[PDB]
């Protein structure tokens, strides 16, 4: 069984085919290297992440200033978690599955990148491998999305009451869920949570790299990614 709270979280998930077709159609309607393409994917996915958050349970109760503070804190972690889960579900050996449904060979991306991006990509695929081995599932994924979004490290929130509540109760429901549905993995809950600091680290390194690439003139023109990089 799935705890009531997690059932409520699942109801807020986007229609994946609709989002997939939207981004593919936008990029189709749109002189771009593979790196530029990845930036465009990130930018378009951020619009979908904001739309998802805005309409989600609990988040929709927050005033816009609180909503902004939370998203400014975690946007890159949500992008990376989204990517990681997509590889867990749809990915395979030596290929990368994109939000458009496009599958690209890993070397097509990696051979064209320098050390920093290669390291980040490699670290991301290690998380993919680890979460595979844990049998990371959709219920756990949506829980982690909410734990990433409702961070206790965000200062000056007006409604910290609600944010701490969500963090506490999603934690409780996730533990209940993993203890129930994966009893043979007695430490699954702890192993899932250990991935959050790793995602934070990768996300911060990714932001620093993209910030450098923007200063260097390598990030294609966009609206949202650049604004979030300055968040």
């Amino acid at each position: 069984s799935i705890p009531h709270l997690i059932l409520e979280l699942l109801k807020c998930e986007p229609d994946e085919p609709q989002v997939q077709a939207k981004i593919m159609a936008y990029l189709q309607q749109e002189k771009l290297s593979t790196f530029g393409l990845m930036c465009k994917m990130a930018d378009q996915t951020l619009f979908s992440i904001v739309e998802w958050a805005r309409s989600s349970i609990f988040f929709r109760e927050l005033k816009v200033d609180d909503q902004m503070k939370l998203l400014q804190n975690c946007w890159s972690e949500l992008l990376i978690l989204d990517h990681i889960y997509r590889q867990v579900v749809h990915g395979k050996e030596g290929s990368i599955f994109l939000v458009t449904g496009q599958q690209v060979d890993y070397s097509i991306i990696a051979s064209q990148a320098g050390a920093t991006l290669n390291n980040l990509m490699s670290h991301a695929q290690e998380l993919v491998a680890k979460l595979r081995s844990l049998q990371f599932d959709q219920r756990e994924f949506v829980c982690l999305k909410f734990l990433v979004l409702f961070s206790l490290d965000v200062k000056n929130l007006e409604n910290f009451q609600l944010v701490e509540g969500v963090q506490e109760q999603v934690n409780a429901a996730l533990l209940d869920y993993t203890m129930c549905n994966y009893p043979q993995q007695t430490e699954k809950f702890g192993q899932l949570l250990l991935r959050l600091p790793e995602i934070r680290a990768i996300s911060m390194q990714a932001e620093e790299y993209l910030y450098y690439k923007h200063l260097n003139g390598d990030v294609p023109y966009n609206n949202l990614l650049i604004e979030m990089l300055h968040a």
Binding site: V50, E51, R54, V64, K69, Q72, L224, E227, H230, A231
Partner: peptide, 12 residues
């Protein structure tokens, strides 16, 4: 932090 575009996307 102030960010006119993010604010707009959340409000619309």
């Amino acid at each position: 932090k102030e960010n006119a575009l993010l604010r707009y996307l959340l409000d619309k």
